[PDB]
Amino acid sequence: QAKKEMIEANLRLVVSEAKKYTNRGLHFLDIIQEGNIGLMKAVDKFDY
DNA sequence: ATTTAGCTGTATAAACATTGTGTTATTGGCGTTATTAAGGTAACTTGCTTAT
């Protein structure tokens, strides 16, 4: 629950990063999904 | 009758045939080098484009 609460606020980060690559042969939706997959794994490792 | 010409006989000769023997060659195998995939990395940029 704590991880989900942290992730939902950071959902827009993938869209913001996805803007730079929009015509690399991959559509925006799949790029956003890849960004979300990267963000979820990254959040658990980081320590305060 | 006699032999003569006819007939190829089968040994022999020759050729083949069989056996043996060499050779080699390739599969297998092993290891080998080319290759390759994934993990990991953390200032900051946290609702898009994309279009007659």
Beta-strand content: under 5%
Number of DSSP helices? 3
SSE string, helix = H, strand = E? HHH
Oligomer: part of a larger assembly
Give Rg in angstroms: 12 Å
Q: Kindly name the structural category.
A: mainly alpha
The share of residues in helices is 55-70%
- CA-based shape: elongated
Task: Give a quick account of the main beta sheet: strands, pairing sense, barrel closure.
Answer: none
How far is the N terminus from the C terminus? 18 Å
Q: Count all strands and give the number.
A: 0
PDB class: transcription
Keywords: RNA polymerase complex, transcription
Entry title: F. tularensis RNAPs70-(MglA-SspA)-ppGpp-PigR-iglA DNA complex
Name: RNA polymerase sigma factor RpoD
Describe the structure.
The protein is an all-alpha fold. The protein contains 3 helices and no strands. The chain binds one DNA strand of 52 nucleotides through α2 and α3.
In terms of topology, how is this protein built?
Layout: H1 2-9, H2 12-18, H3 28-45
Helix pairs in contact: 2-3
The structure holds one DNA strand of 52 nucleotides.
PDB class: transcription
Keywords: RNA polymerase complex, transcription
Entry title: F. tularensis RNAPs70-(MglA-SspA)-ppGpp-PigR-iglA DNA complex
